[PDB]
Amino acid sequence: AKKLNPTVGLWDPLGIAETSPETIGWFRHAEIKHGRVAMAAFVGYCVQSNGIHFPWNIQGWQGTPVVSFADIAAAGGPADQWDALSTPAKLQILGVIGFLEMWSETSVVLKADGQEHYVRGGKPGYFPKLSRSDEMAFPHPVPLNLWDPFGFTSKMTPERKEKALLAEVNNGRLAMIGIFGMISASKGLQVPGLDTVGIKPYAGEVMAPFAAGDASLPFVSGMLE
Amino acid sequence: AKKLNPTVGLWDPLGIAETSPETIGWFRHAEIKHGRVAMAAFVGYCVQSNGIHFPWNIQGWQGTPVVSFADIAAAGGPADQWDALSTPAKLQILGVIGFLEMWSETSVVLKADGQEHYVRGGKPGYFPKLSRSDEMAFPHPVPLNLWDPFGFTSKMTPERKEKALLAEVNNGRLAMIGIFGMISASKGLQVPGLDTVGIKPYAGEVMAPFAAGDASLPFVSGML
Amino acid sequence: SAKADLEAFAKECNPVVGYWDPLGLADLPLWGQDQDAVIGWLRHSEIKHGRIAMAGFVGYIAHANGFRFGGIGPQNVVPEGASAPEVWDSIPFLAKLQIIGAIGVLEHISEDKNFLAADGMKHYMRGGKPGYFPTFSANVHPMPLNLFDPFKWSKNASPEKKAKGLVTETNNGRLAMLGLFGFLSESKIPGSVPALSGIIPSYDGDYMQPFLPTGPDTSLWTIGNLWA
Numbered sequence: 001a002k003k004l005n006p007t008v009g010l011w012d013p014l015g016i017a018e019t020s021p022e023t024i025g026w027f028r029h030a031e032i033k034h035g036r037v038a039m040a041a042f043v044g045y046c047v048q049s050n051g052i053h054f055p056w057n058i059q060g061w062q063g064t065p066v067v068s069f070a071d072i073a074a075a076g077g078p079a080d081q082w083d084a085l086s087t088p089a090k091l092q093i094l095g096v097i098g099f100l101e102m103w104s105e106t107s108v109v110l111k112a113d114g115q116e117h118y119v120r121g122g123k124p125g126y127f128p129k130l131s132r133s134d135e136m137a138f139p140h141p142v143p144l145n146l147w148d149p150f151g152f153t154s155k156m157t158p159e160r161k162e163k164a165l166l167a168e169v170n171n172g173r174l175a176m177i178g179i180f181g182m183i184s185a186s187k188g189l190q191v192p193g194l195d196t197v198g199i200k201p202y203a204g205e206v207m208a209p210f211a212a213g214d215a216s217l218p219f220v221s222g223m224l225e
Numbered sequence: 226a227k228k229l230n231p232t233v234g235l236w237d238p239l240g241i242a243e244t245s246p247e248t249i250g251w252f253r254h255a256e257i258k259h260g261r262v263a264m265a266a267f268v269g270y271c272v273q274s275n276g277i278h279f280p281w282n283i284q285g286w287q288g289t290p291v292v293s294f295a296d297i298a299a300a301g302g303p304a305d306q307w308d309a310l311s312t313p314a315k316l317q318i319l320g321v322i323g324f325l326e327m328w329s330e331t332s333v334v335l336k337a338d339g340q341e342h343y344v345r346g347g348k349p350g351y352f353p354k355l356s357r358s359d360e361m362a363f364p365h366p367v368p369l370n371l372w373d374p375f376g377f378t379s380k381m382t383p384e385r386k387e388k389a390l391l392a393e394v395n396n397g398r399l400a401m402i403g404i405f406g407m408i409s410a411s412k413g414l415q416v417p418g419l420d421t422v423g424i425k426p427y428a429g430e431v432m433a434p435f436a437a438g439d440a441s442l443p444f445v446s447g448m449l
Numbered sequence: 450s451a452k453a454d455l456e457a458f459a460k461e462c463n464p465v466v467g468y469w470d471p472l473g474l475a476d477l478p479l480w481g482q483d484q485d486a487v488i489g490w491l492r493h494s495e496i497k498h499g500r501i502a503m504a505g506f507v508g509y510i511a512h513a514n515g516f517r518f519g520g521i522g523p524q525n526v527v528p529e530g531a532s533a534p535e536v537w538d539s540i541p542f543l544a545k546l547q548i549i550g551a552i553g554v555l556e557h558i559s560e561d562k563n564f565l566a567a568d569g570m571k572h573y574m575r576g577g578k579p580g581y582f583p584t585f586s587a588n589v590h591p592m593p594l595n596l597f598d599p600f601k602w603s604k605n606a607s608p609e610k611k612a613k614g615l616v617t618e619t620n621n622g623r624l625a626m627l628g629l630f631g632f633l634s635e636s637k638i639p640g641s642v643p644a645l646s647g648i649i650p651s652y653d654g655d656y657m658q659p660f661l662p663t664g665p666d667t668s669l670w671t672i673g674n675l676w677a
C-alpha cells in the first residue's frame with residue numbers, strides 16, 4: 001500500500017520506512033493488528049458504556065458462588081468492568097486470546113493454508129483456518145471459524161479484496177486514534193470529554209489486579225503517569 | 226580574499242600576514258567563526274535585554290529546584306541571566322556546543338564530505354552536515370542540520386557564494402565591534418551606548434559561576 | 450596481520466574514531482610474547498571485562514529494585530531492600546566463596562587446553578579466537594547443555610552476523626563498563642556522575658575486597674544437615 005489518500009503521502013518522520021523487508025512486514029502486521037484491536041475495543045467500550053449486560057451468571061458461574069453479571073456490570077465503565085472479574089475469568093480470557101494469537105503465528109498451519117513467512121510476515125493479517133486436514137485432529141472439529149464464520153465473504157475479487165484491506169487499514173488507523181482518545185477522555189484529558197464517561201483505572205494497562213502469585217505489586221501508584 | 230573594500234586593502238600592522246598557509250587558514254577560520262559567534266551574540270543579547278522570555282518550563286525543567294523561566298529572565302542583563310542558569314544547564318549547553326565543535330573539527334567526516342584541512346583551514350567556515358552515511362549512524366537520523374536546515378541556500382552560484390562569504394566576514398567584523406561596544410557600554414565606558422543596558426557581571430569570561438568540583442575560586446575580584 | 454586485524458576491528462567498531470591507542474599497549478611485549486599473543490590477551494581481557502560489566506549492570510538493576518528468587522536459598526538472609534552494594538554483604542560467606550569458585554572453574558574451563566582442543570580450537574594467545582568459550586566436551590561426566598548457546602538457536606548464524614555480533618558486543622561492553630562504574634563511583638563519591646545524584650546511596654565498605662564485610666555463617670541446607 002503506497003498511499004490510500006493521495007493528499008497525505010508517506011508520513012514517516014521517524015524513518016522506520018525503507019528498512020529490512022521483515023521489519024516492514026512486522027510493522028505492517030503490528031499496524032493492522034493494533035487497528036483491529038482498537039476498533040474491537042472501541043465497539044466493546046461503547047456497548048459496555050451504553051449498557052448491554054446479559055441475562056447470565058446462573059448455575060455456579062463464579063466458582064460455586066453465583067455473582068450476577070449485572071453485579072459485575074454495576075461498577076462503572078469498561079475499565080471498572082475489567083477490574084471486577086475474577087482471576088480465573090481474566091486468566092482464561094487471556095489464555096484464549098493467546099491461543100488464538102499462537103495459532104495465527106503458527107507457520108505450519110499458515111504453510112498448510114498456502115501462506116508466506118509467519119509472525120504475520122507475507123500477507124499480514126491472515127488468520128489461519130482451523131479446519132480440514134492436519135489441524136485440530138484431536139476431536140474439536142471447530143464448526144465455526146475466525147474470519148467469515150457465516151461465509152459472508154465467500155466470493156470477492158482481488159481488487160475488491162485490496163480495496164477492502166485499504167479501507168480496513170484506514171479505519172484501523174482512525175480506530176487507533178479513537179480508542180486511545182476515548183481512554184484519555186475517561187482519564188480526564190482529551191478534547192470535548194462530556195458524556196459522563198465514568199471514571200478511569202490507574203492506567204488501563206495494569207491488566208490483572210487482585211491476583212495471586214505475582215500480583216503483590218504496589219508499584220501502580222506512581223511512575224509519573 | 227585580497228580586499229573586500231577597495232579603499233582599505235590589507236591592514237596587517239602586527240605582520241601576521243605573509244606566513245605559513247596553515248597559519249593563514251587558522252586565522253581565516255578564527256575570524257569567520259568569531260564573526261558568526263559575534264552575530265549570534267548580538268541577536269541573543271538584544272533579544273534578552275529587550276525581553277522575549279519564553280512561555281516554557283512547564284514541569285521537568287526545574288521541578289525540584291522550583292525555578293520558572295520568568296524568574297531567570299528577571300535578572301537584568303543577559304550576562305546576569307547566564308550567571309543565573311543552573312550548573313547542569315550551563316554544563317549541558319557547553320557540552321552541546323563542544324560536541325558541535327568536535328564534529329566541525331573531525332577529519333573523517335570532513336574528508337568524506339569533500340573538504341580538506343581538518344585543522345579547519347582550507348574551505349574556511351565549513352560545518353559538516355549531520356546526515357547520510359558513515360556518520361551519526363547509531364539511531365538519531367537528524368532530519369535537520371546546522372546550516373541551511375530548511376534548504377534556503379539550495380541553489381547558489383560560486384560568485385554569489387563568494388560575495389555572501391565576503392558579506393559574512395564584513396558583517397561579522399561589524400557585529401563584533403558592535404557586541405563589544407555594547408558589553409563595554411553595559412560596563413560603563415564605551416562611546417555612548419547608554420540604552421538602560423541594566424547592570425553587568427564580573428567579566429562574562431568566567432563561564433562557570435557557583436559550580437562544584439573546582440569552583441571554590443574567589444579569584445574573580447582582582448586581576449586589576 | 451595482528452595490528453592489521455586490530456585496525457579493521459577498530460574501524461568496524463567506529464568508522465569515525467577508528468584505531469584509538471593513546472597508551473600504545475598494542476606495541477608492548479607484555480611477557481616477551483610477540484605481537485599476536487599480546488593483542489590476543491588484550492582483546493580477550495577487553496571482551497571479558499565487557500561481558501562481566503554488562504552482567505553486573507543487569508544484576509545491579511535487579512538487586513537495587515529487589516528481585517529475589519523465593520525461599521530457602523541465600524536470598525532469605527538478605528534484607529528486603531538494601532541497595533545493590535549491600536546484597537553482596539548479607540549472603541553467607543560460603544555462598545560468596547562458592548560463587549567465586551564456580552567463576553574460577555568457568556575461567557579454568559575457558560582456558561584449559563583439553564576443552565579448547567576438544568572442539569578444534571587453540572589458545573587466544575597461541576592463535577585462537579579471543580572471547581571464545583569451549584563448549585563442555587571434555588569434562589569427564591557429560592554436561593547437558595553448553596554455556597554460549599544453551600538452547601542452540603544461534604547455530605544458523607552467518608559469519609557476517611557473528612562479526613557484527615562481536616562488534617556490538619564490544620561496543621555494548623565498553624558502554625556498560627562506563628555505566629557500571631558510574632554507579633560504583635556515585636556510590637562512593639557524591640557529585641561525580643551528575644545524572645545519578647541522589648539515586649544511589651553511599652556505601653562505606655570496600656568494593657575491591659570480596660570478603661570484607663563478610664556475611665554470616667548460617668546453614669540453609671535442610672534434610673540430613675549433619676554439618677550443623
Ligand code: CLA
Binds near residue numbers: 455462467474623
Ligand atoms: C579494561 C578494559 C579494557 C580493555 C582491556 C581494552 C582493550 C583495548 N581497547 Mg578499549 N575501551 C575500554 C575498555 C577496555 N579496552 C572502554 C571502557 C572504552 C570506552 C571509553 C574503550 C574504548 C576503546 C576505543 C575507542 C578503542 C579501544 C581499543 C582497544 C584495543 C587497543 C587499545 C589498547 O591498547 O588498550 C586500550 C587502553 C587501555 C585498556 C589502558 C588501560 C587502562 C589504564 C592502565 C588505567 C587508566 C585508568 C584511568 C582512571 C582512566 C582515566 C580516564 C580519563 C581521565 C582519560 C585493546 C584490545 C581500540 C580498538 O578498537 O581496537 C580493537 C580503539 O580504537 N578501546
Ligand code: CLA
Binds near residue numbers: 516523525536
Ligand atoms: C555480574 C555478576 C553477578 C553477581 C556477582 C551476582 C551476585 C548475586 N546475585 Mg545476581 N544476577 C546477575 C549477575 C550477578 N549477580 C544477573 C545478570 C542477573 C539477571 C538474570 C541476576 C539476577 C539475580 C536474581 C534474580 C537474584 C540474584 C541474587 C544474587 C545474590 C545471591 C547469589 C545468587 O543466587 O545469584 C543468582 C544469580 C544468578 C543465577 C544470575 C547470574 C548468572 C549470570 C551472570 C547471568 C545468567 C543469565 C540468566 C540467569 C539466565 C536465566 C534463564 C532465563 C530463562 C530466566 C548475589 C549477591 C539473588 C539475591 O539474593 O538477590 C538479592 C536473587 O534472587 N541475582
Ligand code: CLA
Binds near residue numbers: 490493501549550554
Ligand atoms: C579463583 C577464581 C578465579 C581464577 C583462578 C581466575 C583466573 C583468571 N582470571 Mg578471573 N575473575 C574471577 C575469578 C577467577 N579468575 C571473578 C570472580 C571475577 C569477577 C567476575 C573475575 C574477573 C576477571 C576479569 C575481568 C579478567 C579475569 C582474568 C583472568 C585470567 C588472568 C588473571 C590474572 O593473571 O590475574 C592474577 C591475579 C592475582 C594473582 C591476584 C589474585 C588475588 C589475590 C590472591 C588476593 C590476595 C591478597 C590478599 C591481601 C591476601 C589476604 C590474606 C593475606 C593477608 C595473608 C585468569 C584465567 C583476565 C583475563 O582472562 O584476561 C585475558 C581478565 O581480564 N578475571
Ligand SMILES: CCCCCC(=O)OC\C(C=C=C1C(C)(C)C[C@H](OC(C)=O)C[C@@]1(C)O)=C/C=C/C(C)=C/C=C/C=C(C)/C=C/C=C(\C)C(=O)C[C@@]12O[C@]1(C)C[C@@H](O)CC2(C)C
Binds near residue numbers: 500548551
Ligand atoms: C539438591 C540439588 C540442588 C542443590 C542446590 C544448592 O544446594 O544450592 C543452590 C542455591 C541455594 C539453595 C538451596 C535451595 C536449592 C534453595 C534448596 C536446598 O534446600 C535443601 C535441600 O536443604 C539447598 C539450598 C539451601 O542450598 C543457590 C544457588 C545459587 C547460584 C547457582 C548462584 C549463581 C550465581 C552466578 C553468578 C553470580 C554469576 C557470575 C558471573 C559469571 C560466572 C560470569 O560472568 C562468567 C563469565 O565471565 C566469565 C568467567 C568468562 C566470560 O567469557 C563468560 C562469562 C561472562 C559468562
Ligand code: A1ECV
Binds near residue numbers: 086093
Ligand atoms: C471449552 C469449554 C470451557 C471449559 C471446560 C472452561 C473452564 C471453565 C469452567 C469450569 C468455568 C466455571 C467455573 C465455575 O463457575 O465453577 C469457566 C468460566 C470462564 N471461562 Mg473458561 N472459558 C473462557 C473464559 C472464561 C470466563 C469469562 C469464565 C467464567 O466467568 C467462568 C468462571 O470460572 O467464573 C469465575 C472463554 C472466553 C474466551 C471460553 C470460550 O469458550 O471462548 C472461546 C471458555 C471455555 C471453557 N472454560 N471456565
Ligand SMILES: CC(=O)O[C@H]1CC(C)(C)C(=C=C/C(C)=C/C=C/C(C)=C/C=C/C=C(C)/C=C/C=C(\C)C(=O)C[C@@]23O[C@]2(C)C[C@@H](O)CC3(C)C)[C@](C)(O)C1
Binds near residue numbers: 261265287322326352
Ligand atoms: C514535561 C517534561 O518534563 O519535559 C520537559 C523537558 C525540558 C527540556 C526539561 C523542559 C524544558 C526547558 C527547556 C526548553 C530547556 C532547554 C533549553 C535549551 C534547549 C537551550 C538551548 C541552548 C542552545 C544554545 C545556547 C546554543 C548555543 C550555540 C552557540 C553559542 C554556537 O555558536 C554554536 C556554533 O555552531 C555555531 C552556530 C557556528 C559554529 O561554527 C561554531 C559553534 C559550534 C560555536 C520542559 C519545558 O520543562 C519540558
Ligand SMILES: CC(=O)O[C@H]1CC(C)(C)C(=C=C/C(C)=C/C=C/C(C)=C/C=C/C=C(C)/C=C/C=C(\C)C(=O)C[C@@]23O[C@]2(C)C[C@@H](O)CC3(C)C)[C@](C)(O)C1
Binds near residue numbers: 507629
Ligand atoms: C553523566 C550522564 O548524564 O550520563 C549518564 C548516562 C546514563 C545512560 C544514564 C548512565 C548509564 C548507564 C549505562 C551507560 C548503562 C549501559 C548499559 C549497557 C550497555 C548494558 C548492556 C547490556 C547487554 C546485555 C545484557 C547483553 C545481552 C546479550 C544477549 C541477550 C545475547 O548475547 C543474545 C544475542 O547476542 C546473540 C548471542 C546474537 C544475536 O542473535 C543477538 C542476541 C541479542 C539475540 C550513567 C552512568 O548514569 C551516565
Ligand code: KC2
Binds near residue numbers: 615
Ligand atoms: C554474560 C556474558 C555475555 C554477554 C553480556 C554477551 C553479550 C553479547 C551481545 C550483546 C551485546 C552480542 C551481540 C553477543 C554476540 C556474540 N557473543 Mg556474547 N555475550 C556474553 C557471553 C558470550 C560468550 C561466553 C561467548 C559469546 C560469543 C558471542 C558471539 C559469537 C561469535 C562467533 O562465534 O564468532 C556473538 C555473535 C561466543 C564467542 O565465541 O565470542 C568470541 C562465546 O563463546 N558471548 N554477545
Ligand SMILES: CC1=C(C#C/C(C)=C/C=C/C(C)=C/C=C/C=C(C)/C=C/C=C(C)/C=C/[C@@]23O[C@]2(C)C[C@@H](O)CC3(C)C)C(C)(C)C[C@H](O)C1
Binds near residue numbers: 263273304306429
Ligand atoms: C556571554 C553572553 C553572550 C555572549 C557571548 C559571546 C560568546 C560573545 C563573544 C564575543 C566575541 C566572539 C568577541 C570577539 C572579539 C574579537 C575581537 C575584538 C578581535 C579583534 C582583533 C582586532 C581588533 C585586530 C585588529 C587590528 O587592529 C589591529 C591590531 C591593527 C589594525 O591596523 C588592523 C587590525 C584591524 C587587523 C550573549 C550571547 C551576548 C548573551 C548572553 O546572555 C551573555
